[PDB]
Design an enzyme around this catalytic site. Structure first.
Site, short mmCIF file in Angstrom:
data_model
loop_
_atom_site.label_atom_id
_atom_site.label_comp_id
_atom_site.label_asym_id
_atom_site.label_seq_id
_atom_site.Cartn_x
_atom_site.Cartn_y
_atom_site.Cartn_z
N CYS A 1 0.84 -1.19 0.00
CA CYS A 1 0.00 0.00 0.00
C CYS A 1 0.90 1.26 0.00
CB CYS A 1 -0.96 -0.01 1.19
SG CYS A 1 -0.19 -0.46 2.78
N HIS B 1 -0.83 0.95 7.49
CA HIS B 1 -1.32 0.83 6.14
C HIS B 1 -1.62 2.17 5.55
CE1 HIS B 1 -2.79 -1.90 3.05
NE2 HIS B 1 -3.86 -1.14 2.89
#
Ligand SMILES: [Zn+2]
Ligand SMILES: [Zn+2]
Ligand SMILES: [Zn+2]
Ligand SMILES: [Zn+2]
Ligand SMILES: [Zn+2]
Ligand SMILES: [Zn+2]
Ligand SMILES: [Zn+2]
Ligand SMILES: [Zn+2]
Lengths: 440, 85, 96, 82
Positions: free
Chosen positions: A146, A396
């Site tokens: 990510c 993330h």
């Protein structure tokens, strides 16, 4: 939905169709190439009442007259003289005064610069598919990726980059012509996948493959922009050019869009020697956020004078032990200004912590108080946000992007989801992407 | 000064200091670089790169493209001709 | 001898343009409208009016957007731009 | 007839209406285009639970994500590309 039948009629004649398109391209060319004054006076002035900007002014398709909206003067022209089409001089759009509407839905008029090739363009290319038209599409996390895909989303929704990629300028000049080897070629597959037809993860895989041959999204942003530059340099014709781009001025997409420069002023108070002062390229600016609450506060803090504490410092010139005073200022602004909020505090004990302070950022950002020397308003529009969710260690990244027509999307790995301006503005921003919108 | 004052005329002072068809701008336009609506050129030359790309109001229409039926590539309007030939 | 007021209004606008001051006024205005959220409000208001009226007809849609778009301009922007325009007019004209 | 106030206000209203008309033309022609081009058009889906994507779907689990279990795909690449 109807197409205007008046213009359909005119298009049944082959000369007339040709005439309308030459006139539409010339009008549009004139509007792009008239200094403001000439434009006000020659395309924004009503031939009947002579007011400037009496609402929209429409340039007649069949004669030189320009007529306003507010007093129905183009309208009168259409009725009195039989000329029912005019081009709006603020935006190049064609209006039918019988339909009382813009003709917006006729690809040939929209794509009128290709008139002379139209049968080929018709039969060999198609309009975007409903699902690909805004290139919206998720990228699956493939093992902690990510940090790459977040930035990639912002890049493939950047107007400068999309125009570049779809103009085929890299594709036409690339010496590698492999998306396994060339990052820029990999980026083109991504764009290809998302906006046309080549799941929709192949460009991304190829990207990761380019990376096999050799954490922080900010690091990746710098990595990927640097590799776009290298690809450009690798494509250059000779060594003078390679040297020029590397050392003097580079005309690549990265260096004509994302790069500005900072003046690092360092001045001794007693005697003003400033020979440690430098002017440095940036591809983004890193801002402190400890104990602040608004993006403008972080920029004030970036731009404010500070005293350099430097053990046993004496100024070479005048011998003062007074702290020298430093001030950063923007010397050159880039077309797309990328801001990093420094959230990852790497500490003396080796232990990073993450700063979670919410920092308010505007949809419209004015840079005038941060430029170096009365500086005019210089306004950018927010189009991209990358946010970091969770722990320094385990965490993330999400991207948020603004597309044509102002609608915003959250990209959370494979999931792409709709979101409002109001809720995007509540995000804990890590990167912010601002595009140049107005310079006074 | 008064907002309510009836306007007589233009000051002679000011007149002493200053001084057809839309298709006739074409000569001039041919010899005039690309103009922006709301991005002042002296400010551009001063505060921006000498070679900056600028797309004014970039989010005020989608990028106009069409997709090649042969290879599926999204092509910008001004790249289509070339990609056919 | 009476002068044609309509034509006079046209000269005034034209002198504004030739000084460069029409551009300044117009640029100031847009920067204010952009910054205060107004441009976006108008774009939203337009979308809301297309949806409600199930129509994309420009004339119909404008008919309900423009008055509201006019009222949405902050008083600060209005006051401020009007003053700017007044001060430039006092350089150009004679009154009585 | 004409005064400083009337002319000022004339000018402002000229600028505002010109601007408004322009913004409105762009929206409406964009819409006219999208609805003509795509007779079948859906707008993008909006979940207020913040839980459904743009086609009103949930996030697939990455065990079910396959190309190679997607979430292990960079791991598979390390190996397989050697
Ligand atoms: Zn008129
Ligand atoms: Zn005519
Ligand atoms: Zn019609
Ligand atoms: Zn390449
Ligand atoms: Zn470069
Ligand atoms: Zn000193
Ligand atoms: Zn092709
Ligand atoms: Zn494999």
């Amino acid at each position: 939905m109807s197409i205007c039948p008046h213009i359909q009629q005119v298009f049944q004649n082959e000369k007339s169709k040709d005439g309308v398109l030459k006139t539409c391209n010339a009008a549009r060319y004139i509007l792009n190439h008239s200094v403001p004054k000439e434009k006000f006076l020659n395309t924004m002035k009503c031939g009947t009442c002579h007011e400037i900007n009496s609402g929209a002014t429409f340039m007649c398709l069949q004669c030189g007259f320009c007529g306003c909206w507010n007093h129905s003067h183009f309208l009168s022209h259409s009725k009195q003289i039989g000329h029912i089409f005019g081009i709006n001089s603020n935006n190049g759009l064609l209006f039918c005064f019988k339909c009382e509407d813009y003709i917006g839905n006729i690809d040939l008029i929209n794509d009128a610069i290709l008139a002379k090739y139209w049968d080929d363009v018709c039969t060999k290319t198609m309009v975007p598919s409903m699902e690909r038209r805004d290139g919206l599409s998720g990228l699956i996390n493939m093992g902690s990726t990510c940090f790459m895909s977040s930035i990639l989303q912002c890049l493939i929704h950047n107007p400068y980059f999309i125009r570049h990629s779809m103009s085929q300028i890299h594709s036409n000049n690339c010496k590698v012509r492999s998306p396994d080897k060339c990052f820029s070629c990999a980026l083109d597959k991504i764009v290809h996948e998302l906006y046309g037809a080549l799941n929709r993860q192949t460009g991304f895989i190829y990207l990761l493959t380019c990376a096999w041959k050799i954490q922080d999204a900010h690091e990746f942003w710098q990595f990927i922009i640097n590799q776009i530059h290298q690809s450009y340099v690798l494509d250059l014709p000779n060594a003078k050019e390679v040297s020029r781009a590397n050392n003097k001025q580079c005309e690549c997409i990265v260096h004509t869009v994302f790069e500005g420069s900072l003046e690092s002023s360092i001045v001794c108070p007693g005697c003003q020697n400033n020979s440690k002062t430098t002017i440095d390229p940036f591809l983004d600016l890193s801002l402190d956020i400890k104990d602040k609450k608004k993006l403008y506060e972080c920029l004030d803090s970036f731009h404010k004078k500070e005293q350099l504490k430097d053990f046993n410092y004496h100024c070479g010139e005048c011998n003062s032990t007074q702290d020298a005073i430093k001030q950063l200022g923007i010397h050159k602004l880039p077309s797309v200004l990328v801001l990093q909020l420094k959230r990852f505090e790497h500490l003396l004990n080796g232990s990073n912590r993450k700063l979670d302070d919410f920092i308010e950022f505007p949809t419209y950002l004015n840079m005038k108080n941060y430029c170096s020397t009365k500086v005019p308003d210089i306004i950018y529009e927010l189009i991209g946000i990358v946010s970091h969710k969770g722990t320094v260690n385990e965490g993330h990244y999400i991207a948020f992007c603004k597309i044509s027509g102002g609608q915003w999307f959250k990209f959370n790995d494979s999931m792409v989801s709709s979101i409002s301006q109001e809720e995007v503005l509540k995000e804990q921003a890590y990167l912010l992407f601002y595009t140049i919108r107005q310079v006074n | 000064r008064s907002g309510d004052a009836e306007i007589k005329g233009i000051k002679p002072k000011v007149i002493e200091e200053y001084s057809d068809s839309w298709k006739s701008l074409m000569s001039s336009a041919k010899d005039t670089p690309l103009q922006y609506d709301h991005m002042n050129r002296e400010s551009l030359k001063k505060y921006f790169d000498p070679n900056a790309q600028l797309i004014e109001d970039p989010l005020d229409k989608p990028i106009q493209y069409r997709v090649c039926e042969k290879c599926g590539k999204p092509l910008a309007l001004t790249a289509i001709v070339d990609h056919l030939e | 001898m009476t002068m044609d007021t309509a034509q006079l209004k046209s000269q005034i606008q034209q002198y504004l343009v030739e000084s460069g001051n029409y551009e300044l006024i117009s640029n100031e205005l847009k920067a204010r409208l952009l910054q205060e959220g107004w441009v976006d409000k108008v774009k939203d208001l337009t979308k809301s009016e297309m949806n409600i009226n199930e129509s994309t007809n420009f004339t119909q849609i404008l008919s309900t957007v423009e008055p509201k778009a006019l009222e949405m301009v902050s008083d600060s922007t209005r006051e401020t731009v009007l003053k700017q325009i007044r001060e430039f007019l006092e350089e150009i004209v004679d009154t009585q | 007839t004409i005064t400083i106030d009337s002319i000022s206000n004339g000018i402002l209203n000229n600028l505002l209406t010109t601007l408004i008309q322009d913004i409105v033309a762009r929206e409406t022609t964009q819409q006219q285009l999208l609805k003509t081009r795509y007779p079948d058009l859906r707008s993008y889906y909006f979940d207020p639970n913040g839980s459904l994507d743009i086609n009103g779907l949930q996030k697939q689990q990455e065990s079910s994500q396959y190309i190679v279990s997607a979430n292990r795909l960079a791991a598979h690449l390390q190996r397989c590309l050697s």
